[PDB]
Every structure is written in structure tokens, then in C-alpha cells.
Design a protein around this motif. Structure first.
Motif, PDB file in Angstrom:
ATOM      1  N   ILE A   1       0.846  -1.188   0.000  1.00  0.00           N
ATOM      2  CA  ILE A   1       0.000   0.000   0.000  1.00  0.00           C
ATOM      3  C   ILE A   1       0.883   1.239   0.000  1.00  0.00           C
ATOM      4  O   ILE A   1       1.677   1.445   0.926  1.00  0.00           O
ATOM      5  CB  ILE A   1      -0.960   0.012   1.198  1.00  0.00           C
ATOM      6  N   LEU A   2       0.721   2.072  -1.022  1.00  0.00           N
ATOM      7  CA  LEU A   2       1.411   3.346  -1.136  1.00  0.00           C
ATOM      8  C   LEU A   2       0.495   4.477  -0.681  1.00  0.00           C
ATOM      9  O   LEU A   2      -0.731   4.363  -0.729  1.00  0.00           O
ATOM     10  CB  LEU A   2       1.859   3.596  -2.576  1.00  0.00           C
ATOM     11  N   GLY A   3       1.107   5.576  -0.239  1.00  0.00           N
ATOM     12  CA  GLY A   3       0.374   6.745   0.185  1.00  0.00           C
ATOM     13  C   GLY A   3       0.248   7.783  -0.922  1.00  0.00           C
ATOM     14  O   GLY A   3       0.750   7.627  -2.031  1.00  0.00           O
ATOM     15  N   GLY A   4      -0.445   8.868  -0.590  1.00  0.00           N
ATOM     16  CA  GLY A   4      -0.637   9.953  -1.531  1.00  0.00           C
ATOM     17  C   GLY A   4      -1.131  11.227  -0.882  1.00  0.00           C
ATOM     18  O   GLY A   4      -2.004  11.189  -0.010  1.00  0.00           O
ATOM     19  N   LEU A   5      -0.579  12.364  -1.296  1.00  0.00           N
ATOM     20  CA  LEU A   5      -0.979  13.670  -0.785  1.00  0.00           C
ATOM     21  C   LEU A   5      -1.130  14.624  -1.959  1.00  0.00           C
ATOM     22  O   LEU A   5      -0.156  14.891  -2.671  1.00  0.00           O
ATOM     23  CB  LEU A   5       0.045  14.210   0.218  1.00  0.00           C
ATOM     24  N   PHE A   6      -2.339  15.134  -2.160  1.00  0.00           N
ATOM     25  CA  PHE A   6      -2.624  16.027  -3.269  1.00  0.00           C
ATOM     26  C   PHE A   6      -3.436  17.221  -2.792  1.00  0.00           C
ATOM     27  O   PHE A   6      -4.217  17.107  -1.844  1.00  0.00           O
ATOM     28  CB  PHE A   6      -3.391  15.298  -4.380  1.00  0.00           C
ATOM     29  N   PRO A   7      -3.268  18.381  -3.430  1.00  0.00           N
ATOM     30  CA  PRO A   7      -4.044  19.583  -3.061  1.00  0.00           C
ATOM     31  C   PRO A   7      -5.390  19.669  -3.782  1.00  0.00           C
ATOM     32  O   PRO A   7      -5.600  20.439  -4.720  1.00  0.00           O
ATOM     33  CB  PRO A   7      -3.108  20.721  -3.465  1.00  0.00           C
ATOM     34  N   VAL A   8      -6.335  18.840  -3.332  1.00  0.00           N
ATOM     35  CA  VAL A   8      -7.658  18.811  -3.950  1.00  0.00           C
ATOM     36  C   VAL A   8      -8.370  20.143  -3.752  1.00  0.00           C
ATOM     37  O   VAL A   8      -9.001  20.670  -4.676  1.00  0.00           O
ATOM     38  CB  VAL A   8      -8.481  17.636  -3.392  1.00  0.00           C
ATOM     39  N   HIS A   9      -8.283  20.707  -2.551  1.00  0.00           N
ATOM     40  CA  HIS A   9      -8.880  21.994  -2.237  1.00  0.00           C
ATOM     41  C   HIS A   9      -7.793  23.028  -1.974  1.00  0.00           C
ATOM     42  O   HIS A   9      -6.626  22.696  -1.750  1.00  0.00           O
ATOM     43  CB  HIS A   9      -9.807  21.889  -1.021  1.00  0.00           C
TER      44      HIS A   9
END
Ligand code: A1ENR
Ligand code: A1ENR
Ligand code: HVG
Ligand code: HVG
Lengths: 743, 743
Positions: free
Chosen positions: A10-18
Motif C-alpha cells: 500500500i502506497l500513500g498519496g498527498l494532493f491539493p484537492v482543495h
């Protein structure tokens, strides 16, 4: 409010959706391009990896994707949500976008040994292996961008720039790197460095523009700022009527965006921007265009994206049948390739680790129950594969990526405006200046290149600015740094660098102030010659005998010598002609004013012999020569400063003989005839010489001095000799020639 | 490796017991003063609170104290050790010492709502209520320190300084605050701003000193740096022989420490430092001196402190019987009061919260099972009590403390050196300059105050530096900014600011070039008077009748008028005396050179009448006046530039009458007597006037012009009149006077 897909690793993820909230609220609006597109790209990459049979065979990859809301505290909370069991285990995290967010998340993740790979963070501070042990990125750091900016600045010839930095880690670190590289290399000088605040008060941007206008000679601005700050700076510049003054050089935060220059084309035309190399992916385009609500329920933010994209709410009512790229304009976000490359890099690292640790096995071996963080990082740092754009993906020993940039310039031609590619930077600049369209080539220099003759005074500190001023007309130019006076006895050249030949004047037979003396001298010589020739044939004549047979001849010779003096003293000053002429001066004067059987012998030879030895004394003790009389005649303007040639017989040296001859002339002249004529001659000569003192000294000097003095002397002496000869012999001549019987 | 004391409410603690490791190691050596003393002070405060019956009655306070090792990552790990159950619960944390450590710990603790109070962090960035919600401090932020530094700089008159900042949050933020306050207030200009790296290469400090020497006029340095950096900077300055050039102004990081100036007194003498107000606590001293191993097993780092203090290991062998302050030197750490005050502030906040929420109860009410973080912070922000030094402890609405500072200066007198108190800063500076002992008062100014006459040219940008230069001698000083030429028709004053009265010369009876004409004029007048008086009594004499009874009188009057001209023409140029004098000029000349029964009437009156009306014509058309003849006589040196006074009769206007009179003089003079004397007179006059052209025009000008021209004219005219009168009447006079029978 979080995406979970199960699997074996399982890999993680961080994105600027808002985006950041306006005030007192963590999350604001929705970023369709920055938030949705990147997470969709990550999901597409995961699906491709799972479908690929040659990569991670029989091993499934899962994801735990969260949101950051463009704020580092929210991302800190989500990162804590990652590490809780330390149960599913996160093997790696796809890094954040902003530098601060990535910095804080990497600060958290270093403790639990979780490798992190970012796709949009470029801060140099993350390249320190002693502080961020488990951080890698597929984009180059800002050191390479600063070096490229310095190379571009020095390639166009500019050497005087100003810097703008947005508050934060990105802009300030970029500007600091640029300043340090500039100081180390040397050649370009920074005038001002500003700081755009995070929350500016009204009128701040106009104040910044006005401060930038405190240096009119720094027309180039290096900008590391956000798009909103760029737009507001351009708005202020347009408002203050500077459409053509500033020249812009932007970082990747400007790039090829259209919003900051939407209706401000004229103020931003000719701006130069730098972007990492990238391309478009058609597979992602097809995958995204194929999405509908009935088959994309995995995404939990997709309904909000649908509403904010097609303009309805499910105002207009959504029919649930719209398709993207048909009912609205569609364009890929620029950073999809980097996200896909990061995901594939993690997959390839896991593949290599599985190949080494668990050999000859299908699936996952029992030894591989728990992934080791340090070994996984070591495998990550040594991957080498071709990405989704056909370009290699590699890492340094620090975890960065090689610097490979493209350069754009905003250009306006007629109605079409577009960022045009002009060059690139791959470990060395490649810039095609022939395709640069400004507003020929502009200039941003502190000091203009000076003309030949000045003294350059480099200002203390900055070597870029010099103030050059032209020295006086009395000096020349030794070099660009100093002046010196060659005319210690000369004149300077017209360029104030050399040393010109000195002008000089003379009295060489020139018509003014020299033709009257010779004109009267010729007549006097003719008259004296006629008189003496008349007497020669009549030496026996009774009136001649009464006058003395040889008494007259010596006198006539004396006045002839006086005429010889009055004539040949105007030709030239040298050591041949005017040398020794003053002995003839004195000889003629003494004869003419003294000589007036053996008695004649003694009274003609004795006194002339004593005066001859006297004049010989100072002709030997004071020999003649040629003089050049610059001396005190140093006219301030060299063109008006001309010298003169004169005989070495000084001003008071030509007069010394006269005094002896004057005293000899006074009365030494020695009921009968010829007595009263001699008396009249003496009276006339006395009245002639009475006025001589102002005549022989014009007390004017200036430039007429030689001419006035010579003319006065020659005229006075010739006239005195003429009267002396005349008022005694002309008559007798008339009796001899005209009336013969009167004898 | 951690201190745990149980209780009902448990507070946290973070102290720098150990220092940063040299390389690859988290913790290095032991800090006896910074680490042990502060945690011992916290334990002493906790014991005092527990023993006090009027504060937190029947409620026990526990502690969970950990170590930070002066590194923010270690403190991050320990802060995570705090929040794990979110079982004992931490109600509050006593903050860290370094700014970065406190920043990271506060970033962690804001999520779980845990109030934090620091005792040594002064970073301004922690005053933001939108980022650090639960942070408070008992020391003032660096904004007040920067304001105090600006006030001190401007109080001593300095306006040109340089800044040194150590890498990190503390120094950079302090220097930024100082720069912003300086820019806002205006009056002091920053020359350079340096940056000491965290890990400097060899020779870095010498390079920094040399860069600081690129501006000799900036002798004041503002320093926000660590003690090691201060010591190394001072070492470099001493090595480069600058013992007396720089003037130091340090922050609280310098304070009153002795290590940076241990054997470098001369390079650091006269340094000014600022510290928060503080005092010593005797109770802590007694408690610390009472500690032995047999009764202080609560501290787990105490054996290491014992070994590193008394020099033995339990080398010399520890006897287990040593006592502090006897076998080694002892001195309190400066920041004990602040730690005790923070602990007491937390205790008082808990007391007030218990008083409000759980009224009329002994101990802890069931409603108070869990402490609420936000309400606890609200209670913390509103405490008001007297601390351990008798001074109030209060907070702002941001959680900071009021700025109250003391100022020290390092001074060397004979052999004793010590930091001496000179003033303080409590919302306003109070500085006693009379007790400042430098090396009178020094100076750090970009430009010296200029003398009166110059033009001040303020440089673009910085208003502090001006280059002033003195303009030419032909101009004055309008103001300190510009010059102008008053002498358009004047001269400048000696100070090159005013406008002096113009010097002027004249010919008012002065002895040179004016006494010879009057000397000969007196004699001529006497001779003419004697002649005419002799003739008057003998008007019937036969030789008088032959000469004409009235023929002589008109002539004698004419030559007397010529003498009147030759005399009274030297007095002064005005509109009274020299005005209309030229009609007498012409009248006398025409008489003397023309008059030479009714026939006499007509030939004496007709021609003089026509010439009289002629001269009247141009005396009316050309009236006289006074002239001031600066004109082209503008000598470059004003002191040598003197004017002159002359009659308005121009240079060529005095000569116009002569030409008519000259033509009248030529031959118009009208076997018998007196004929040959008149012929001789005419010849003599002709020879007199032959040479007049250079006589009447000295063609010199210069400064002799008026004198030479006037003297030549008067002398020539007087001599001509004298000869004309003489060579005709003197004889006849001799016959009349001496020999009477010859008649
Ligand atoms: C009698 C004294 C002497 C011989 C004399 C006679 C005449 C003149 N000058 C003139 O007659 C005027 S023409 C030649 C001249 C021109 C300009 C200058 Br200034 C001086 C002389 C000069 C000296
Ligand atoms: C035509 C001759 C006339 C009467 C004359 C004769 C002599 C003088 N001057 C002198 O003999 C010398 S005294 C006046 C003087 C002083 C200095 C200078 Br420089 C020139 C003249 C002036 C005019
Ligand atoms: N290089 C900076 C940084 O690392 O801070 C950066 C990172 C990400 C983005 C982005 O979300 O697109 C931007 C941008 O807005 O252009 C800028
Ligand atoms: N004000 C700064 C800061 O906030 O970082 C500071 C904080 C703590 C200490 C200390 O441990 O004694 C020092 C110092 O070394 O004197 C300096």
C-alpha cells in the motif's frame, strides 16, 4: 473524504484537492486541474501497474490517498493518519506539491523510515542528507534553476538586476540561491531585493512598484512569486503607466500560465520563463475522457468536480449524461508525467527488491513479510528506466534529479499571443537570441560604456557601477582610469589622449608689420647710392674739397650701414643671419653719429676700435643662439597657444650698444660753411630721439611685441639716419648735378 | 533516561540536557548550566507548589521531563512520546529553549490542544495567533528587542550600520525585524548584511571580516549570533589587526557571557548587549547546594553531572562525599526565574479553573475528570501574580510578555573587566551616556557634516550618504544644495555665500603717473605768467608794436589755456569737473595753433566760433556722464578684479577735436623779423607731432591704460605749447628785461 484501495503493498498519496480557506476555515474551493487531475493520474498509473504482467507479477498495489487543502497543518494531520499502527502498513508516500507541505511531511516520516518521492517540490533545502534522509524528487532543485537564470542574465549582457521573492520557503530560497551564485561568479550586481508579504495591506503592490522605480537603470526583475502575486504586480505596474519599462524573468511558478496575463498583455510582453521538460500523455487523456459517474464511484470528490465543471448541481439541473471535453474545454495539467514517473519509480524499486531478496518465487516470499525502509530507499536511489514520455528517470546520491529546462518568452504579434520556445538548459545554456521579440535588443546596465578620454572611478563595493568624467583640456588620457598633463612644455592632442606638436609663429618676411621698413629701406639705399655715386666722379670738386675729400665717404658708409641694419633684421631669427648682427648695429650707429689727414685716421679708428672690442666682449661672453619663447605665453586654450622664434639676444641686450652710441651722438659731432647745417642736423636728431623711450618700448607685449618693437626700432633708426644724411648732402648734390656753373 | 513523578495533574518538560553531536551522533556532551540547572529549578518549583497549602489544595502535581539534546528532531520524537494515548494525560508542557525546537513542538501540540509555555524562545514568528494557537512565553519577543536596538543606534547619533545574522530562525528573524523597523522609521541606513553558515569552511570568518572591511565608514555591527560564532568572529578580527575599528552591539545571545571574550578583551571592549530583566533566587541555591547522591536519585542524569563537575569518575576516584560550591565554583544560570514563573503560571491557571468550574469542593470534582485545553489556554492568558523575583507576570492577547530589558557594556579599567549596567528599556529607552567608556564619543556616519559653501548631492536610494563639493570661485552658495553666480556685475564674498562690494581704482591725485604733468604744468604757467606780465607794462615798446599790440595777447592766452588743460585733467572723472572740459581742450589747441586791426578780430573769432559750435554739437548730442568700466576687465580672481572710474567721453571722443585743430595747425599759421622764428616753431611742432601716433596710443591697455594715455597726451600737448610759446617770446622778453638800451 479519503480514497482507499486494498492490495498487498500500500502506497500513500498527498494532493491539493482543495485550496486554502479565506479566513478561519481550513479548506476553500476546488482545484479541478491541480487536485483532481493529479490523483486521477496516480490512480491510472496504479491501474496500469496492476494490469502489467511483467511488473510486480501476482502482486497487487493498493493506495491510501488523502487531501492536503494546500495547508501544511492539514497535511501534518493526514501524515499522522498514515503512521498510526507504528494492520495495513504504508510502504511509501508520493510526496506533496508545495515545498512547506513536503518539508513538514518529510520531517514526520523520517522517524518511521518511510521513503517519500515528490513530484512538484523544488526547494534546495530538501537536498540535505543530514536532515531529510528519506526524501527524493523527480523534479530538479532550484540550484540548477538559479544557475540557469544567472547564465541567461549574463548571456544577454545585463549586469544590474532586482529580485522579487514571495514569502515562504520556495521564493526566498530561490532568491537566496540566485544571490549566492551571482556573488560567487561575479559579473552581475543586485540593486534591490523586495519581499511580498503573505497578507498585504491595500496599496502594497503600488508601493513595491514605486520602490522598484527608485533605480531607473535596473530594468530587469527576477521573480520567484505566486501567480496571484504576479497578477497583482502586473496590475500595479499597468496602473502606474510603466508599460515598457520593466523586463521580467520568471521561475516555474509563472511558467506558461494564462491567468496572470489574461487582459494585461502589454505590461507582460517579453517575459522570460523557465519550466522543467515535460510532455502530454494520451493514455491519461483517454482514461479521463472515459469517466462517468456510473463507473467512477472510487473517486469520492468526483461529484463536486462534476458540478463545478459542467455548471449544474445534482441553477441548472445535471442530466447525468454530460461528457468531458465536449461540454467544456479540457486540457491536461502539466505535472501528470511526474506523478506517473514517481509511482513507476516506487514500483520498479519494489520489483528490484523482490528480485534480490526473494529469488525464484511467484508472489511474495515469507522473508518479505515486512518491507525494510532503509533498503527500500537504497533501491529507490538506484533505479534506471524510461518513463511515460520516453525520457530516462534517474537520481543522484542525494535523491534529486538532473536539471533539464525549457525556456519560453511571451510574445504579441498582431492578435495571436503565446509562449514561444526559444532555448533550453541541460547542464549548459542553449539560447537562440535571433528569435527573441522584444517590444533592437534592450539593455539593463548600471553605467554606460564611456568615450575615450575620462577617468573611470569604480565605486566602493559593487564593481558594476562606475562614474566617468572628462578631465580638463590641459591633460591627456593615460588610461581609462587617470589623466596627466603632457603639456609641461607641449600641447595636448585633440582627443585629450595624445600630445600634439606645438604651434609657433615668426616674422619671416610676412607682409603685416614688415613691408613698410623694407619699403623705406630700399628708397634710403637708392638715395644714398645716388649721392655717393655723384660724389665719386667729382672728388676734385671745390665744394667737395671744402667738405673734405674723404670726410664724406666714411659718413656715407656709416649711414649705408645703418640702412643695411634697418633692412636685414626682419628676415629670420637663427644662429646664422641674426647672429652677430648687433655688432653691425653698433658699428653703423657709431659711424653715423661719430664720424660727423691723419686726424681723420685717428678720430675714425680709435673710438670705433674701442667700442668694437667692447661689443666683442659681450658677443663672446654672451654668445647667440635660437630661442623658443613659450615661457609665460601659455594661453589657456592650447589651440590659441602658439610659440614664437626669436634671437638669443635678449630684450635688453639689443639696447646696450645704443647707450654708448647715444652718449657718443650727443655732442661729440665736430662764420664758415657747413656749420649751421650740422647744427640743424643735431637739433633734428635730438627731437627725433626725444620721444624714443615710449617708441622703443610699446609696453604692450601681448602678441604684437616683436612686431611693434622691431618696427619702431627700424623706423626710428632709419629716419634718424635719413635726416642726418639728408639735411647736409642732398643740397650739395643738387648743386653738383643740376646747376654746373655754381662751383 | 526520562524523569517521571506521579500525581493528579501531570505537566511536561523539555530541556537541553545534552548538546548537539559532533557528527552522525544525536547527543554530545553534557551542559551543566543549561541542562541540569533548569530541570532542577522546575523540580524545585513543583516541590514548592506541592508543599504550598494555599495553591492547589489537596491536588498533586506530577512531571514527565525528557531531553531534547539541542536538536529539533530528537525533541519531535519526545513530543510524540508525550501524545500517545490520544492512561496518564499531559495537561501542559513547559516549552523548549531554542526557537526551532519550540516551533516544531508547538506545531505538533496544536493538534491535540495542549497549552505550551516557553521560557527562552524569543522568535517573533511565534506571535501569530493563526498558526500557533496554544503557545505562550514569559520572555518578550524580538520585535521589542529590535525596536530597542534601533532606539539605541539613533540615540548615539549613528546612521550607518551593518548586520550579522547566524543561520536559523532566531538570528535571521531578529535581523529582518531590525531592518523592517529601520526602513519604516527612517534615519539609519544598512550598508551590508552577512550570513554566517551553519557549517563554515576554513577561513570563512576572515572572509566575513574582510567583506565587512569593504565599507570603512560603517563601524557599527548589529549581531544576532551564537556564542561560538561571536568568539570566532572576534578571533578573526584580532588576527586581522582591527583592535579598535569595529563597534559591537549584541543581542541576548551575547548577554553577559565570559567565554566569547575569555582572552580577547581588547577586540571586544566597548560592546553593548541587551538582556531581559532577571534576578537570582536564593531558595533554588539552597536546594541545589543541599543535593547529594544519597537523596537525589530522582534525577537520572545526576551521576554524569557529578563526574563532569568534580573531575572524578565513580583519573581520580569519587569519594561520594563532595559538596557543590565548595569543591568547585558555582553560579546560577540566568534563566531559572523564567522556568519557575512558567511553572507557577500553569499552576495559577489550574487553580483559577478549579475555582470556577468546581466550586465549594475539596480536591477534584467529577466534572473536572478531563482538563479542557482551550479553556485552560484562556485561563492561562489572563493570570496576574507576583513571581519569584517580586515582579509581575502577565500576558498579552497573543500570549507574549511585555518588553523589559537591561543594557550592559563591556569595559576594561586597569585589570578589572566586567559588564556594567548603563540603562534600560521599558516601552521607552533610558540610556545614561555619561557612563559609557569607549576605548570622546565615537562616530559611525556615512558622510561628514560639510562646511558652509558646497552643493549637497543626495545619492539615489539611501538618504544617509551625500557627496558635497565646493563650487567655483565665481559663484556663491544659494543653499546647501546649489550654487549661483552673483557676480553678473559684482564680486562674490569671501565665504562663497554672499556678494562683496566691487573694488574700484581711479587717478585721484595719486603720486605715480600724475605728479610729473602737474610739476611741468606749474613751471609752464609761471613762465607764461612772467612773459605776459613783462609785456603788459611795455605795451608801447617798439618791438611790442612790431610784434603787434594785441597780436601777442591772444596767443599767450591760448597757450595759457593749453596749460590749464594739461593741469586740470588729472583730478577726477565726474559730471562736474571733467564734464565739458574737452571744449576747453579744443579751444586752447585752436588758439595756440591758429592765432599765430579788424583783421585780427575776424581771423580770431570766425574760425573759433565755427569750431565752438561744432564741439557744442557733439557735447549736446553726446552728453557726458560717469562710467564704471568693469566691462571686459573681469579678472578671474575677484580679489584681483578691480574696476575703474572714467569720464563718459569715450576713448575716440577725446581725439575728435584734435583732427580739426591738427589741420588748422598744419600751415594756417600766418626779409623782415619774426618770420624765421615762426618757421623754426613750425618745424619743431611738426617734429613733435610726427611721433604722436604711438605716443597717443600705447596699445597696451592692461591696467596702465588710463595712466599711460593721459600722461602721454598731457606731456605731448604741454611740450608742444611750451616750445611754440618759447621759441618766439622768451628772447624778446630777455631783451625787454635784461638789456634796456637795445630797443
Ligand atoms: C618718430 C618716431 C618713430 C620713428 C615712429 C614714427 C612713426 C610710427 N608709426 C606710424 O607712423 C604708424 S605706422 C607703423 C606702425 C603701426 C602700428 C604700430 Br602699434 C606702430 C607703428 C612709429 C614710430
Ligand atoms: C611725442 C613725444 C611726447 C612729448 C612724449 C615724450 C616722452 C614721454 N614719456 C617719457 O619720456 C617717460 S615719462 C612718461 C611715461 C612713463 C612710463 C611709460 Br611705460 C611711458 C611714459 C611721453 C610723451
Ligand atoms: N515549485 C513550487 C514549490 O516547490 O514550492 C511549486 C510547487 C507546486 C506548484 C503547484 O501546485 O502547481 C507550484 C505552482 O503553483 O506553480 C509551485
Ligand atoms: N533567544 C534565543 C532563541 O530564542 O533561540 C536563545 C534561546 C535560548 C538560549 C539558551 O539556551 O540559553 C540562547 C543562548 O544560547 O543564549 C538563545
Amino acid at each position: 473524504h479519503s480514497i482507499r484501495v486494498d492490495g498487498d503493498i500500500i502506497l500513500g498519496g498527498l494532493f491539493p484537492v482543495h485550496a486554502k480557506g479565506e479566513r478561519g476555515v481550513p479548506c476553500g474551493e476546488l482545484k479541478k486541474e491541480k487536485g483532481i487531475h493529479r490523483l486521477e493520474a496516480m490512480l491510472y498509473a496504479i491501474d496500469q501497474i496492476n494490469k502489467d504482467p511483467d511488473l510486480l507479477s501476482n502482486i497487487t498495489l493498493g493506495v491510501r490517498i488523502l487531501d492536503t487543502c494546500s495547508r501544511d497543518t492539514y497535511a501534518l494531520e493526514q501524515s499522522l493518519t498514515f503512521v498510526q499502527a507504528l494492520p495495513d502498513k504504508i510502504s511509501g508516500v508520493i510526496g506533496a506539491a508545495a515545498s512547506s507541505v513536503s518539508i513538514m511531511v518529510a520531517n514526520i516520516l523520517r522517524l518511521f523510515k518511510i521513503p517519500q518521492i515528490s513530484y512538484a517540490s523544488t526547494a534546495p533545502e530538501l537536498s540535505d542528507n543530514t536532515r531529510y534522509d528519506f526524501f527524493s524528487r523527480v523534479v530538479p532543485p532550484d540550484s540548477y534553476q538559479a544557475q540557469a537564470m544567472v547564465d541567461i542574465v549574463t548571456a544577454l549582457g545585463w549586469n544590474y538586476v532586482s529580485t522579487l521573492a514571495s514569502e515562504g520557503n520556495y521564493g526566498e530560497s530561490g532568491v537566496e540561491a540566485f544571490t549566492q551564485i551571482s556573488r560567487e561568479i561575479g559579473g552581475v550586481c543586485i540593486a534591490q531585493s523586495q519581499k511580498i508579504p503573505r497578507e498585504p495591506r491595500p496599496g502594497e503592490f503600488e508601493k513595491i512598484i514605486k520602490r522598484l522605480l527608485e533605480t531607473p537603470n535596473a530594468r530587469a526583475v527576477i521573480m520567484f512569486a505566486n501567480e496571484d502575486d504576479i497578477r497583482r504586480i502586473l496590475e500595479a505596474a499597468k496602473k502606474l503607466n510603466q508599460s515598457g519599462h520593466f523586463l521580467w524573468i520568471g521561475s516555474d511558478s509563472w511558467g506558461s500560465k494564462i491567468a496572470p496575463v489574461y487582459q494585461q498583455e502589454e505590461i507582460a510582453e517579453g517575459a522570460v520563463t523557465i519550466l522543467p521538460k515535460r510532455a502530454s500523455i494520451d493514455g491519461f487523456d483517454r482514461y479521463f475522457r472515459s469517466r462517468t459517474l456510473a463507473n467512477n464511484r472510487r473517486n469520492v470528490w468526483f461529484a463536486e468536480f462534476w458540478e463545478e465543471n459542467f455548471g449544474c448541481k445534482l441553477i441548472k439541473k445535471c442530466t447525468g449524461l454530460e461528457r468531458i471535453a465536449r461540454d467544456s474545454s479540457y486540457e491536461q495539467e502539466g505535472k501528470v508525467q511526474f506523478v506517473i514517473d514517481a509511482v513507476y519509480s516506487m514500483a520498479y524499486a519494489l520489483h528490484n527488491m523482490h528480485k534480490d531478496l526473494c529469488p525464484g518465487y511467484i508472489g511474495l516470499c515469507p522473508r518479505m513479510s515486512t518491507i525494510d525502509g532503509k533498503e527500500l530507499l537504497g533501491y529507490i536511489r538506484a533505479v534506471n528506466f524510461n518513463g511515460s514520455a520516453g525520457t530516462p528517470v534517474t537520481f543522484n546520491e542525494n535523491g534529486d534529479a538532473p536539471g533539464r529546462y525549457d525556456i519560453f518568452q511571451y510574445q504579441i504579434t498582431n492578435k495571436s499571443t503565446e509562449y514561444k520556445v526559444i532555448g533550453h538548459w541541460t547542464n549548459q545554456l542553449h539560447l537562440k537570441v535571433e528569435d527573441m521579440q522584444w517590444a533592437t535588443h534592450p539593455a539593463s546596465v548600471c553605467s554606460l560604456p564611456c568615450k575615450p578620454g575620462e577617468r573611470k572611478k569604480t565605486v566602493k563595493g559593487v564593481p558594476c557601477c562606475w562614474h566617468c568624467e572628462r578631465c580638463e583640456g590641459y591633460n591627456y588620457q593615460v588610461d581609462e582610469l587617470s589623466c596627466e598633463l603632457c603639456p609641461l612644455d607641449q600641447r595636448p592632442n585633440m582627443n585629450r589622449t595624445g600630445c600634439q606638436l606645438i604651434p609657433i609663429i615668426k616674422l619671416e618676411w610676412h607682409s603685416p608689420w614688415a613691408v613698410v621698413p623694407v619699403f623705406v629701406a630700399i628708397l634710403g639705399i637708392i638715395a644714398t647710392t645716388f649721392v655717393i655715386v655723384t660724389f665719386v666722379r667729382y672728388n676734385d670738386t671745390p665744394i667737395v674739397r671744402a667738405s673734405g675729400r674723404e670726410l664724406s665717404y666714411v659718413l656715407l658708409t656709416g649711414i649705408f650701414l645703418c640702412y643695411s641694419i634697418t633692412f636685414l633684421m626682419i628676415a629670420a631669427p637663427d644662429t646664422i643671419i641674426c647672429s652677430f648682427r648687433r655688432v653691425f648695429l653698433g658699428l653703423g650707429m657709431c659711424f653715423s653719429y661719430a664720424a660727423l689727414p691723419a686726424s681723420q685716421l685717428v678720430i675714425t679708428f680709435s673710438l670705433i676700435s674701442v667700442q668694437l672690442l667692447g661689443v666683442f666682449v659681450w658677443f663672446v661672453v654672451d654668445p647667440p643662439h635660437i630661442i623658443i619663447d613659450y615661457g609665460e605665453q601659455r594661453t589657456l586654450d592650447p589651440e590659441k597657444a602658439r610659440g614664437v622664434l626669436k634671437c638669443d639676444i635678449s630684450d635688453l641686450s639689443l639696447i646696450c650698444s645704443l647707450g654708448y652710441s647715444i652718449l657718443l651722438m650727443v655732442t661729440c659731432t665736430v662764420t664758415f660753411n657747413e656749420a649751421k647745417p650740422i647744427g640743424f642736423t643735431m637739433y633734428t636728431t635730438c627731437i627725433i630721439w626725444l620721444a624714443f623711450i615710449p617708441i622703443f618700448f610699446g609696453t604692450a607685449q601681448s602678441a604684437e611685441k616683436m612686431y611693434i618693437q622691431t618696427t619702431t626700432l627700424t623706423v626710428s633708426m632709419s629716419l634718424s639716419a635719413s635726416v642726418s644724411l639728408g639735411m647736409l648732402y642732398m643740397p650739395k648734390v643738387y648743386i653738383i648735378i643740376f646747376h654746373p656753373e655754381q662751383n
